[PDB]
Amino acid sequence: KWTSAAVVTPPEPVQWQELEKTFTKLRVLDLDIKIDRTEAFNLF
Amino acid sequence: DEPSLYTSWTLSFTAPTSEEAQTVLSGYIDYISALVVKESIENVRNKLEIKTQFEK
Amino acid sequence: DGIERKLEIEKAVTDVAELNGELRNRQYLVEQLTKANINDVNFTPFKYQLSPSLP
Amino acid sequence: KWTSAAVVTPPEPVQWQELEKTFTKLRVLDLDIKIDRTEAFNLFIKKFQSVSLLEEYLRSSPYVMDQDELDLHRAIVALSEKMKAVDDNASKKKDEPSLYTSWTLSFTAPTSEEAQTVLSGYIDYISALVVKESIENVRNKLEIKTQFEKEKLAQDRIKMKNQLDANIQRLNYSLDIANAAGIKKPVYKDDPDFSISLGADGIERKLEIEKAVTDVAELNGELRNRQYLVEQLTKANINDVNFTPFKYQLSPSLP
Amino acid sequence: EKLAQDRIKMKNQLDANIQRLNYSLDIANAAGIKKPVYKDDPDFSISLGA
């Protein structure tokens, strides 16, 4: 009878900043690691 | 023929009330996000565990 | 005369790290790796063009 | 009844000059970043097509709110169905390239005035969103650059205190060996593990010196200069710079 | 801007070299090298003499 709808898009860089701070501490500890924005969408 | 400028998906839920439809769809998305967040931070921790195990 | 003393010294080395920078630094890196933890960072794995609508 | 129209293309180099100045400050500090002119255009288009952003613009617009309960929502949904964006090169497809990109933005209204005030308003609204987020990204990149360098320096200092401490031990041993071998004055070759050609007198003094070293940057200019870099990154900031993320070919018409 | 930066980076080097050279002096004196030695330490060159 009634349909609710959303339209979702892969996330944008501004939403990743907290995540990026983490990857930066680890980079210094010689551990190169990331979460691809599009992969996180696809997993969603 | 014309690939769109950005990926996008339409998610939808259908119910007897309009408000019920909105509430279930919104809550399911939230729930799914929590799973993506959780398992993602756990990948990162896992990689740190392996880096540490190795180096040590 | 010199070799005699160098030998005495080499036989008394207890920690190989004492004379080796790289090995001190690796011990550092490991301490730092063990110290580090990952916060519960919240993020959203998408961006709404349209958030769930009230039909 | 009255459709107002606008035609937009990616922005041009002349519109990007304040931006370019800012990127130049950062380039000096070893940070190489731009806002791509086409990416800012695409972001404007994406944003423009966001129905949630459009509803928010409408609700927040005093002009719109003049034109009464929970039909409010319905009127909004209905109004929001009259913003359209079309790529001018979708219709008439491939094989005939596009010299320039270009989109048609439009709003249809009861009156001529209404359609033009609402297309402009909405455009300027979305445009501000692109500007705000684009500066945000730039600021974020600066934040990360700074975090990284600051952290790497801390690490490099500890790595060198370590290397220096290992050297002090070696030097202690060089001293014993030189003494045993009777080299007091410099030799007039060397052992590869414990250098002694300097002689015990010279080594003693070299040894007090290395032991009295506190800040490893004292004798290392690359560290002084990394310290300097981090001071500069920390002091640098990105000003609220204003730009438009498109060039009008047709600015919103009066039908 | 790069030039103003480069001058500062360079003054920083000079300052580091002045400290190094100070230590060269002290080590040359301890070793009894007053006149140039008409081998050399890789950290504090002393061959020019005190």
Side-chain angles (χ1 to χ4, degrees), chain A, chain B, chain C, chain D residues 1-67 69-93 95-255, chain E:
Chain A
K1 284 181 190 182
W2 302 104
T3 297
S4 187
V7 175
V8 298
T9 261
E12 299 164 358
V14 284
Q15 297 168 78
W16 242 233
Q17 193 57 2
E18 259 175 73
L19 248 20
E20 214 73 67
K21 291 202 271 184
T22 288
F23 309 152
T24 286
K25 327 207 233 308
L26 302 176
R27 185 165 323 118
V28 160
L29 298 183
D30 194 63
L31 168 53
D32 205 306
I33 182 197
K34 65 194 206 68
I35 300 185
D36 189 74
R37 272 185 276 110
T38 293
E39 273 157 37
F41 178 73
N42 294 166
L43 176 61
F44 173 82
Chain B
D1 189 13
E2 249 92 66
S4 173
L5 222 51
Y6 51 83
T7 297
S8 76
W9 282 57
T10 278
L11 313 175
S12 70
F13 185 68
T14 276
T17 335
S18 100
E19 183 199 331
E20 169 198 345
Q22 214 210 205
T23 304
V24 164
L25 175 68
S26 179
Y28 187 47
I29 282 165
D30 288 354
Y31 172 86
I32 290 308
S33 297
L35 295 172
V36 187
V37 170
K38 179 189 150 151
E39 185 189 301
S40 285
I41 299 304
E42 206 196 290
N43 281 162
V44 169
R45 290 194 181 110
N46 286 345
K47 282 146 158 186
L48 175 58
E49 201 190 344
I50 298 297
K51 226 298 193 206
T52 297
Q53 194 207 314
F54 185 65
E55 288 304 326
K56 166 174 189 163
Chain C
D1 290 333
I3 295 163
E4 221 170 301
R5 185 80 183 115
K6 185 181 164 164
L7 180 67
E8 220 151 82
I9 289 160
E10 280 183 348
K11 273 165 150 148
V13 160
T14 261
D15 187 1
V16 293
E18 169 207 20
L19 283 175
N20 198 290
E22 298 105 284
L23 237 51
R24 296 191 182 214
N25 289 341
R26 300 198 68 194
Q27 173 56 224
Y28 176 60
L29 179 56
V30 177
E31 283 158 12
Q32 290 315 122
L33 284 167
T34 309
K35 248 152 200 141
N37 66 95
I38 310 300
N39 289 334
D40 296 283
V41 175
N42 202 45
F43 60 103
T44 321
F46 56 84
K47 163 91 186 141
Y48 279 133
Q49 287 285 101
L50 183 67
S51 65
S53 61
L54 195 74
Chain D
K1 280 182 76 238
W2 308 101
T3 306
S4 185
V7 183
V8 299
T9 68
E12 287 180 23
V14 286
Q15 312 194 62
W16 226 241
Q17 182 60 2
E18 291 170 71
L19 251 27
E20 208 71 59
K21 290 193 195 146
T22 290
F23 303 146
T24 288
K25 289 191 204 159
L26 305 177
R27 206 178 310 123
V28 168
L29 305 181
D30 193 42
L31 177 56
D32 205 21
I33 59 193
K34 23 132 221 160
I35 301 153
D36 193 4
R37 271 177 9 242
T38 292
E39 267 172 28
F41 179 86
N42 298 153
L43 183 57
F44 169 90
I45 289 295
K46 184 168 155 214
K47 271 194 193 329
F48 183 102
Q49 301 189 281
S50 154
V51 169
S52 288
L53 283 184
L54 173 60
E55 293 177 7
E56 186 186 284
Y57 168 64
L58 299 163
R59 270 163 217 278
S60 80
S61 166
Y63 179 94
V64 176
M65 300 292 67
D66 294 343
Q67 0 275 252
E69 290 204 315
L70 288 168
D71 301 298
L72 220 203
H73 180 79
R74 305 220 233 148
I76 292 319
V77 171
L79 267 190
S80 85
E81 277 159 5
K82 307 184 171 201
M83 279 292 171
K84 309 155 205 284
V86 306
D87 181 350
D88 285 345
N89 319 296
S91 52
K92 150 233 141 198
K93 294 130 189 159
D95 188 57
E96 280 218 306
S98 77
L99 201 85
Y100 56 90
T101 298
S102 102
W103 281 60
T104 307
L105 307 178
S106 52
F107 192 56
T108 302
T111 35
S112 176
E113 268 206 89
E114 201 196 329
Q116 183 187 73
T117 319
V118 183
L119 191 57
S120 286
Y122 184 49
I123 281 164
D124 296 338
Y125 168 88
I126 296 298
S127 155
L129 257 23
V130 170
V131 173
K132 150 159 171 156
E133 279 202 11
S134 292
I135 271 67
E136 214 180 324
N137 286 162
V138 168
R139 296 193 165 126
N140 282 4
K141 276 158 184 160
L142 177 51
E143 184 160 58
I144 295 312
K145 177 56 170 189
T146 310
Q147 179 184 144
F148 182 77
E149 293 295 334
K150 169 187 202 182
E151 252 149 61
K152 258 277 146 141
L153 181 56
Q155 208 197 43
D156 285 349
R157 305 188 106 100
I158 283 153
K159 276 163 126 175
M160 299 185 51
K161 172 89 247 170
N162 282 352
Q163 193 48 62
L164 170 64
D165 291 330
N167 296 345
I168 278 150
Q169 283 299 136
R170 198 174 287 279
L171 201 40
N172 249 305
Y173 292 148
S174 283
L175 175 52
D176 285 349
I177 301 163
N179 277 326
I183 297 166
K184 298 231 155 174
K185 292 162 203 188
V187 154
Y188 297 126
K189 272 168 161 294
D190 222 336
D191 182 274
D193 307 290
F194 309 98
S195 177
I196 72 182
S197 57
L198 191 45
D201 295 345
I203 294 164
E204 251 153 66
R205 202 60 172 78
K206 196 185 168 172
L207 183 54
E208 315 166 10
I209 293 171
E210 300 213 311
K211 278 183 159 176
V213 159
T214 281
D215 181 349
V216 296
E218 193 207 351
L219 308 170
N220 188 345
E222 273 146 13
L223 250 44
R224 299 193 187 208
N225 285 344
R226 285 202 68 176
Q227 174 66 46
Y228 177 59
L229 183 65
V230 172
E231 293 167 2
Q232 292 306 107
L233 289 158
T234 291
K235 293 198 186 204
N237 77 97
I238 295 146
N239 301 323
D240 295 284
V241 170
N242 224 261
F243 61 104
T244 326
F246 60 80
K247 169 85 191 195
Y248 277 135
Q249 285 283 286
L250 177 60
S251 64
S253 57
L254 187 56
Chain E
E1 279 189 43
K2 194 95 190 91
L3 170 60
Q5 175 183 84
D6 278 344
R7 291 178 57 88
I8 283 160
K9 284 171 153 165
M10 190 97 13
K11 216 283 198 296
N12 290 355
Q13 264 298 148
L14 183 51
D15 290 346
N17 295 342
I18 285 166
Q19 286 308 114
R20 202 177 277 281
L21 187 59
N22 230 307
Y23 296 148
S24 285
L25 185 43
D26 292 353
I27 300 162
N29 280 312
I33 303 191
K34 291 190 192 148
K35 287 175 300 216
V37 198
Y38 325 118
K39 183 198 140 59
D40 201 25
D41 186 88
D43 304 296
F44 313 96
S45 181
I46 60 167
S47 75
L48 173 63

